[PDB]
């Protein structure tokens, strides 16, 4: 009766910040309750641990109040069978929502909306009775979003809040032998929601594991590990504190053993009872052991050396009651003199922020995925990750511990949508709620070596609640520093200056919470902390421009110790078309309102875990080896702090315009932070004209746990020389033949023919034989299909006048009208010469002026010359080039320039100058939300079909016009056009990326010169 | 002004104070006081309570106040009288010249305490000169020290009035009662009597 | 029904450190709500402020569970008339205890003892309706030791812990014009007790 919904729901615990849990047990590190040492030791699987994951019964309701009492007793008829864990929105029950800042619900804390989607989960299962006899049996919910009530065998059990941490309950008193039934009522909204405003998809359900744990009545209730070292790390002290629950008896003992794989390194045994702590005594129920270790093996992202620790609770006679264990890593994290140190050295964080997201599973995680991520990261030179913005699936930590990644554990608190942001955080009333959120995380994760920094959450302003919490940790766990960006990134609540989106050299002086250039920030009067950006280089779409600027600063300023890119994967979901075709969806794609469109897409990889081109730039900028070239010597520098170049091969090679003339292989031998000199054999001195370039690569001969054999970890290239061509084109036996008409001019030469329309002034068509070559005339082009960055947050409804796109639009760039100023033809002794002049205008203003010359000789080549003038008072144009639609369509693309991936002016350091050949398809970048893409710069020769272009330009080539791209919102809606679209740019604006909601392209990358010149050569084979 | 928190009987004393679980409870206790009394000029120091050992909960609370009300210092004696949780060294019952070196929470002579390596805070005894019955011997010793050492800024005597209650004899005669006088068990007898004045407010 | 003891006491909020209050308003400095400057200025007395101190009706029980639902509705027969504020031990209801360090009860947080002396206080009073028309009306307990539940006109209102600070509740929705009745159930032990071990008389 009191177990009745009617009654339980009476209280509406989900609308009371004062109630965050009911009868939930206390937090702690991971238990298995092994009943055998070896097992625990070898991390086998414990039988006192049982998963309840699988098929369950589900039913959905628009509101809690609509639930039926029967439910408690009996399963429903209309119930469905579902797999757990999972997100109900992923099963079509309701929609997933995608907002960033704005709360999905109405802001009226601590009130949630009357219509609050309820998910009734139920499960019937059997229990061994042996369990029922002795010991304790509890259930564990690794993750339930957002809040929920629980019943067992018809009996009300408890309540819980905080979608990201475990919830435990003692079932011991509700279990019957044999068949039992669980009834979990889960709710979308709760007061907890107010603390969970992360910019992610808003979902719900039992998205994390469910289990049962059988523990002895007298058991290990908790334990902590700590390492201490001597000044040189030649000796450590493992110190373990253990707490027990149960019946205290003098024959109880505890043994802690340290293992190095097969070897037992140290052991210690003792009886309960601590040292005096105060006037009343000590902890009778605790005990602390101290193990000494000589020449311990240190743990690091570079070399995750691990040890295993075993905690055995037993009697004096030797009888074991139970065992617990964990992996241990010897490392010391400390901030000293402005620097963040690890094991004595100063780190350089090559980090990234990462959400728990699966295109198919929603927020549900699994080993497989996790590992994928890890491997990728490692493979791309990352060494750290930030749990944006809640505690992760437990397994994660282990993996990181094992694989080697620095981690920032972050509390599940974001109140982004409040106003002002710290409205809650500065309120005592919410303190307790917040507290729970921090404390619990700590208790759970504190023994993992990979965790090196605690974080109080994200975007929640700065409030006293923070200060208090910050302090709490400090007292409880002094082994790791604490950071928090809210309220200015340098408050009393952070041990590190951890801004987000601060620029390298430019200040953004917002009131109250200005973002200084990072170099300046460091030097403010009185400032002494290290600086690490919690978020930077917004990777939304075609982005990452400027990345190198950061890396360079990082490398030059000691106190700038890196940052975490934003972010790992796109938060895109799959949908299907009627043909059962899957496609990537984003904000509003589920009729979800309100929503933030593509904003959920900012990763370096696609949800499927396929890389965006940007990834490469990252990998390159983050390499662990740095090169210097001096004469014939290569200087190599190691950015490793702990390892030696023991799996490194250096391949080098020389080529002339793509023609390889020499290669070499040299094994690396460099100590962490050391230098290696590399002597080059005498280099070739070709006569032929061209550019001589040197290229080095670093290879990993042997595979690793995270990499294959032959992995490339670093590269670098240099231009050795140049041999200017002083040659002359041999004579032609003939010369083109001009032919006027009213409409045009005709140039003929053999099978070749070119035509220029006299009204438009453009080269309208050209033939080879009887084959027309263009579907569209060759013309000047000044715009681009806006990048995400070009758009920012401008919306049709709510336009952002400073967005590039906005300006371009307003300027009429997108719709200016060309006007022939002049067009003439002339016959020279050795060729035909055409000259034109056009003007683009808009509303009486002249934006650009394009003056060209086309000169066709007897060799059949057409040389083009372009000179443009840009009004100083118009917004710098996205680009300056030409375009046309070629009638032909080929398989491959071959060029001599920067490659092979997409590269832009402010994003091309990772690219190499060579000869590339790819399939047309590869020249396209399937950004979910479409825009200008696939460009390659620094090109000297381009070949497609019978065509060849020469000069010095950048280009792109695909089947989609810029207009198409510009007019389509999803990749899945593009359809190839008739021939091949080609854009050849003399110049192209940068892409930016410092952030995606303001103009982020640096001046050096803007087309602000006023006058531009370029030349080109076109021919056929 | 002192928060309503004493866990004296725990064991060890900070059993609760060092537990997150009790944090919220404790919090309420502090926060609320502050919100209520902060505008009174007479209040010049906030105190986190009494005899509850020293626990993280304390640190957090200490900090909270500091942030919210920077106008007054915060003190707390628990756990040694000189923890990170107090702006002042505020022991109770430390002697003028003699040290009482209890393990973990020794009570140094107050003159010595001041000079410990690294110590810089002022010292004010939160409790001293136990006025139980025929007492107060030695009082002058303190006063003199106080007067001679700048950093010794005084203290609060323990305590004002006797905590005695009235009872009646059969002749309807009233009489002062103490521990166990109500059959109350267990009890601490006269210990409730340590004032400078009698409950009626008549001076000792 | 949900206002029923049977139901309310179900939860045993007094044995849960997680629950320290229910529907209690937020803390703040002292208000009078003067409606005239001068008054406030000269610290006169505000009429938006009313004392409920005086004679009330009291009844004592060895345990909460022993209370009678009737109580909610109707005053008791065996109820006594008492002055408030006051300490029930001072009226002979039970004994005052004098321990210093040692807890008066058994140490088993957050558990309190089954026999936990309950004091049922009740009060019937009249409310001007003008108050009932506009504005907000709340009640204020300057001090209740140690924990307690509250009802107004038969309706369950809230809960509170911490014997030394005020507890406030908005009555606005439970008041009727004219006659109203308050029912306050007060408890000796509560989880709060674990935080109130001062060496003083336990009342
Ligand atoms: O990828 C989204 C990021 O948004 C930033 O917040 C911006 C927000 O995008 C913008 O709409 C608003 O005008 O300004 C905010 C600046 O605080 C976040 F800060 C990032 O962490 C991402 O969520
Ligand atoms: O007036 C009583 C005072 O007792 C002190 O505590 C003593 C206690 O009296 C004694 O029985 C025990 O052995 O040692 C305690 C020392 O911590 C208090 F500290 C004072 O504040 C008074 O309560
Ligand atoms: Mg709640
Ligand atoms: Mg956000
Ligand atoms: Mg309680
Ligand atoms: Mg005491
Ligand atoms: Na640096
Ligand atoms: Na985003
Ligand atoms: Na002095
Ligand atoms: Na006393």
CATH number at residue A686: 2.60.40.10
- Tell me the backbone φ, ψ of residue C87, rounded to 5 degrees: -110, 120
Helix (H) or strand (E) holding A181: strand A178-187
Of B26, B38, B188, the CB nearest to C98: B188
Q: Positive or negative CA dihedral for A68, A72, A74, A79?
A: positive
Q: Measure the CA–CA gap between A580 and A357, rounded to whole angstroms.
A: 23
Beta bridge partners of A754: A747, A766
Name chain A's partners: 3 or more CB pairs within 8 A.
B, C
A272 lies in the same domain as A340: no
- Tell me the backbone φ, ψ of residue B50, rounded to 5 degrees: -155, 155
Distance A517 CA to ligand 8 centre (A): 23
Structural domain contains residue C183: yes
Are A848 and A875 within 8 A, CB to CB?
Answer: no
Which of A986, A936, A938, A983 lies closest to A963 in space, CA to CA?
Answer: A983
A533 lies in the same domain as A458: yes
Measured between CB atoms, does A429 come within 8 Å of chain C?
A: yes
Q: How far is C122 from chain B (nearest CA, A)?
A: 27
Environment class of A231 (CB within 10 Å of its CB; exposed 0-12, middle 13-18, buried 19+): exposed
Q: Which ligand is nearest to the CA of B144?
A: 9
Q: Measure the CA–CA gap between A92 and A573, rounded to whole angstroms.
A: 13
A459 part of the active site:
yes
Q: Measure the CA–CA gap between A626 and A638, rounded to whole angstroms.
A: 7
Measured between CB atoms, does B32 come within 8 Å of chain C?
A: yes
A211 lies in the same domain as A223: no
- For the CA of B8, the closest atom of ligand 2 is 17
Structural domain contains residue C3: no
Cα separations (Å) of A243 from A137, A255, A446, A656, B82?
A: 19, 12, 15, 70, 28
Q: How many CB atoms lie under 10 A from the CB of residue A155? A: 14
Q: Measure the CA–CA gap between C105 and A484, rounded to whole angstroms.
A: 43
Which of A531, A528, A547, A527 lies closest to A539 in space, CA to CA?
Answer: A547
Tokens describing residue C144:
């209740």
**Residue A199 CB less than 6 A away from ligand 1:** yes
Structural domain contains residue C4: no
Q: Measure the CA–CA gap between A106 and A109, rounded to whole angstroms.
A: 9
Distance A333 CA to ligand 10 centre (A): 47
SS3 content of chain A, % helix, strand, coil (to 5): 15, 40, 45
Structural domain contains residue C6: no
Q: How many CB atoms lie under 10 A from the CB of residue A647? A: 18
Structural domain contains residue C5: no
Structural domain contains residue A4: no
Helix (H, G, I), strand (E, B) or coil at A964: helix
Q: Measure the CA–CA gap between A534 and A350, rounded to whole angstroms.
A: 11
| Cα Rg, chain C, nearest whole Å | 18
Q: How many CB pairs under 8 A join A and C?
A: 22
Q: Measure the CA–CA gap between A695 and A712, rounded to whole angstroms.
A: 13
Which of A800, A804, A779 lies closest to A789 in space, CA to CA?
Answer: A804
**A410, A436, A459, A902: which one is catalytic?**
A459
Best of A4, A5, A9, A10 to disrupt the C interface (most C CBs within 10 Å) is: A10
Q: Say whether B119 counts as a known binding-site residue.
A: no
Give Cα B103 distance to the centre of its chain.
20
Which DSSP string corresponds to A294-308? Answer: ESPPBB-SS-B--EE
A646 lies in the same domain as A677: yes
- Structure solved using which method? X-ray
Count of domains observed in chain C: 1
- Residue bearing tokens 């929640």: A460
Q: How far is C38 from chain A (nearest CA, A)?
A: 33
Are C122 and C74 within 8 A, CB to CB?
Answer: no
**Residue B191 CB less than 6 A away from ligand 2:** yes
A853 lies in the same domain as A984: yes
**Residue A570 CB less than 6 A away from ligand 1:** no
Distance B176 CA to ligand 10 centre (A): 16
**Residue A118 CB less than 6 A away from ligand 1:** no
Q: Measure the CA–CA gap between A799 and A795, rounded to whole angstroms.
A: 5
Helix (H, G, I), strand (E, B) or coil at C159: strand
Tokens describing residue A435:
């507290």
Q: Positive or negative CA dihedral for A568, A571, A572, A574?
A: positive
- Tell me the backbone φ, ψ of residue A540, rounded to 5 degrees: -75, 105
Best of C18, C28, C197 to disrupt the A interface (most A CBs within 10 Å) is: C18
Q: How many CB atoms lie under 10 A from the CB of residue A230? A: 9
Are B125 and B91 within 8 A, CB to CB?
Answer: yes
Q: Which ligand is nearest to the CA of A353?
A: 1
Distance from first CA to last CA of chain A, Å, rounded?
90
Q: Which residues contact A366 (CB under 8 A, 6 or more apart)?
A: none
Which CATH number belongs to the domain containing residue C202 in this structure? 2.60.120.260
A282 lies in the same domain as A170: no
Which DSSP string corresponds to C66-110? Answer: T--THHHHS--SS-EEEEES--GGGGTSS--EEESSS-SS--BTT
Contact C166 B36 (CB under 8 A): yes
Give Cα A475 distance to the centre of its chain.
32
Q: Which residues contact A160 (CB under 8 A, 6 or more apart)?
A: A20, A21, A22, A24, A141, A144, A147, A148, A150, A167
Give Cα A1000 distance to the centre of its chain.
19
Q: Are β-strands A384-386 and A406-410 bridged in parallel, bridged antiparallel, or unpaired?
A: parallel
* Domain boundary pick from A331, A360, A379: A331
Output the residue whose Cα is nearest ligand 1's atom 16: A997
Q: Measure the CA–CA gap between C202 and C199, rounded to whole angstroms.
A: 9
Of B14, B59, B67, the CB nearest to A472: B59
Distance A579 CA to ligand 1 centre (A): 36
Distance from first CA to last CA of chain C, Å, rounded?
32
Environment class of A974 (CB within 10 Å of its CB; exposed 0-12, middle 13-18, buried 19+): middle
Beta bridge partners of A765: A755
* Domain boundary pick from A185, A216, A247: A216
Q: Measure the CA–CA gap between A340 and A796, rounded to whole angstroms.
A: 46
Tokens describing residue A949:
């272009």
A523 lies in the same domain as A442: yes
Beta bridge partners of A83: A55
- Residue bearing tokens 């203290």: B155
Which CATH number belongs to the domain containing residue B38 in this structure? 3.20.20.80
A264 lies in the same domain as A356: no
Which residues 72-111 of B are in CB contact (within 8 Å) with A? Answer: 78-80, 84, 102-105
Classify A609 in phi/psi space as left (phi over 0), alpha (psi -120 to 50) or beta.
left
Tokens describing residue B134:
């025929």
Q: Which residue of B has its CA nearest to A475?
A: B56
Tokens describing residue A1009:
């010169």
CA dihedral C104, C106, C109, C113 (to 10 degrees): -90
- Residue bearing tokens 């000259």: A835
A383 lies in the same domain as A234: no
Which of A34, A13, A52, A81 lies closest to A152 in space, CA to CA?
Answer: A52
Classify C93 in phi/psi space as left (phi over 0), alpha (psi -120 to 50) or beta.
alpha
User: Which range of residues forms the domain containing residue A713?
Assistant: 623-728
Which CATH number belongs to the domain containing residue A884 in this structure? 2.70.98.10
Q: How many CB atoms lie under 10 A from the CB of residue B82? A: 19
* Domain boundary pick from A216, A231, A251: A216
């Amino acid at each position: 009766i009191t177990d009745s919904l009617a009654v339980v729901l009476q209280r509406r615990d989900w609308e009371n910040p004062g109630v965050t849990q009911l009868n939930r047990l206390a937090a702690h590190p991971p238990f298995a309750s092994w009943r055998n040492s070896e097992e625990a030791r070898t991390d086998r699987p414990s039988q006192q641990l049982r998963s309840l994951n699988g098929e369950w019964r589900f039913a959905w309701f628009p509101a809690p109040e609509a639930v039926p009492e029967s439910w408690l007793e009996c399963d429903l008829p209309e119930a469905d069978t579902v797999v757990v864990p999972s997100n109900w929105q992923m099963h079509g029950y309701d929609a997933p929502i995608y907002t960033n800042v704005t709360y999905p619900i109405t802001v009226n804390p601590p009130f949630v909306p009357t219509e609050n989607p309820t998910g009734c989960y139920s499960l019937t299962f059997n229990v061994d009775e042996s369990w029922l006899q002795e010991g304790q049996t509890r259930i564990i919910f690794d993750g339930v979003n957002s809040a929920f009530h629980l019943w067992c065998n018809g009996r009300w059990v408890g309540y819980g809040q905080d979608s990201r941490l475990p919830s435990e309950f003692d079932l011991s008193a509700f279990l019957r032998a044999g068949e039992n039934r669980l009834a979990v009522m889960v709710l979308r909204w709760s007061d907890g929601s107010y603390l969970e405003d992360q910019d992610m998809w808003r979902m719900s359900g039992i998205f994390r594991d469910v289990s049962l744990l059988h523990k002895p009545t007298t058991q290990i209730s908790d334990f902590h590990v700590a390492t201490r070292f001597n000044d040189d790390f030649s000796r450590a002290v493992l110190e373990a504190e253990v707490q027990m629950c149960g019946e205290l008896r003098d024959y109880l003992r505890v043994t802690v053993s340290l293992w190095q794989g097969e070897t037992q390194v140290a052991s210690g045994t003792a009886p309960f009872g601590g040292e005096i702590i105060d006037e009343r005594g000590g902890y009778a129920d605790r005990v602390t052991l101290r193990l000494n270790v000589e020449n311990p093996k240190l743990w690091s992202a570079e070399i995750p050396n691990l040890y295993r620790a075993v905690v055995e609770l037993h009697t004096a006679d030797g009888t074991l009651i139970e065992a617990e264990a964990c992996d241990v890593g010897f490392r010391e994290v400390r901030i000293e003199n402005g620097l963040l140190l690890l094991n004595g050295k100063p780190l350089l964080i090559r980090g990234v922020n990462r959400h728990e997201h699966h295109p198919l599973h929603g927020q549900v995680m699994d080993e497989q995925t996790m590992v994928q991520d890890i491997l990728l990261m490692k493979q791309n030179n990352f060494n750290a990750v930030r749990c944006s913005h809640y505690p992760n699936h437990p397994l994660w930590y282990t993996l990181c511990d094992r694989y080697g990644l620095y981690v920032v554990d972050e509390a599940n608190i974001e109140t982004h949508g409040m106003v002002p942001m710290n409205r809650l955080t500065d309120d005592p009333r919410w303190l307790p709620a917040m507290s729970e959120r921090v404390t619990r995380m700590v208790q759970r994760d504190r023994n993992h070596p990979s965790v090196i920094i605690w974080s109080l959450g994200n975007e929640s302003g700065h409030g006293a609640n923070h200060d208090a919490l910050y302090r709490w940790i400090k007292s409880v766990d002094p082994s790791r520093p604490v950071q928090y960006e809210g309220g200015g990134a340098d408050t009393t609540a952070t041990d590190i200056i951890c801004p987000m989106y601060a620029r390298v050299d430019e200040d953004q002086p917002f009131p109250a919470v200005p973002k200084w250039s990072i170099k300046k920030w460091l030097s403010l009067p009185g400032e002494t902390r290290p600086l690490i950006l919690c978020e930077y280089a917004h990777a939304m779409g075609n982005s990452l421009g400027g990345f190198a600027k950061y890396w360079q600063a990082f490398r030059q300023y000691p106190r700038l110790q890196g940052g975490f890119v934003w972010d790992w994967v796109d938060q895109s979901l799959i949908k299907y078309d009627e043909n059962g075709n899957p496609w990537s969806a984003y904000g509003g794609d589920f009729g979800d309102t309100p929503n933030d469109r593509q904003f959920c897409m900012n990763g370096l990889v696609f949800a499927d875990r396929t890389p965006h081109p940007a990834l490469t730039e990252a990998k390159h900028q983050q390499q662990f080896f740095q090169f210097r070239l001096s004469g014939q010597t290569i200087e190599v520098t190691s950015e490793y702090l702990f390892r030696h170049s023991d799996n490194e091969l250096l391949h080098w090679m020389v080529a002339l315009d793509g023609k390889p003339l020499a290669s070499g292989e040299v094994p690396l031998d460099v100590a962490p932070q050391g230098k290696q000199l590399i002597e080059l054999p005498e280099l070739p001195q070709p006569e032929s004209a061209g550019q001589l370039w040197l290229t080095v690569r670093v290879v990993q001969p042997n595979a690793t746990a995270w990499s294959e054999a032959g992995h490339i970890s670093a590269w670098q290239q240099w231009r050795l020389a140049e041999n200017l061509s002083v040659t002359l084109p041999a004579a032609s036996h003939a010369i083109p033949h001009l032919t006027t008409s009213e409409m045009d001019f005709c140039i003929e030469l053999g099978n070749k023919r070119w035509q220029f329309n006299r009204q438009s002034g453009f080269l309208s068509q050209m033939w080879i034989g009887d084959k027309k070559q263009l579907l569209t005339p060759l013309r000047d082009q000044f715009t681009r299909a806006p990048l995400d960055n070009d758009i920012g947050v401008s919306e049709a409804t709510r336009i952002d006048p400073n967005a590039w796109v906005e300006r371009w639009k307003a300027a009429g760039h997108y719709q200016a009208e060309a006007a022939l100023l002049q067009c003439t033809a002339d016959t020279l002794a050795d060729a035909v010469l055409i000259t034109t002049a056009h003007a683009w205008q808009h509303q009486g203003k002249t934006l650009f002026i394009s003056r060209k010359t086309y000169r066709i000789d007897g060799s059949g080549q057409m040389a083009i010359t372009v000179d443009v003038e840009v009004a100083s008072d118009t917004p710098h144009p996205a680009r300056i080039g030409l375009n046309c639609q070629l009638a032909q369509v080929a398989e491959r693309v071959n060029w001599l320039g920067l490659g092979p991936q997409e590269n832009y002016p402010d994003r091309l350091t990772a690219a190499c100058f060579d000869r590339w050949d790819l399939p047309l398809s590869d020249m396209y970048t399937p950004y979910v939300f479409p825009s200008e893409n696939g460009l390659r710069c620094g090109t000297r020769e381009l070949n497609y079909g019978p065509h060849q272009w020469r000069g010095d330009f950048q280009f792109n080539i695909s089947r989609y016009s810029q207009q198409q791209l510009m007019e389509t919102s999803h990749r899945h809606l593009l359809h190839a056009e008739e021939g091949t679209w080609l854009n050849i740019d003399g110049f192209h604006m940068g892409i930016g990326g410092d952030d995606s909601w303001s103009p982020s392209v640096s001046a050096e990358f803007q087309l602000s010169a006023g006058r531009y010149h370029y030349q080109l050569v076109w021919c056929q084979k």
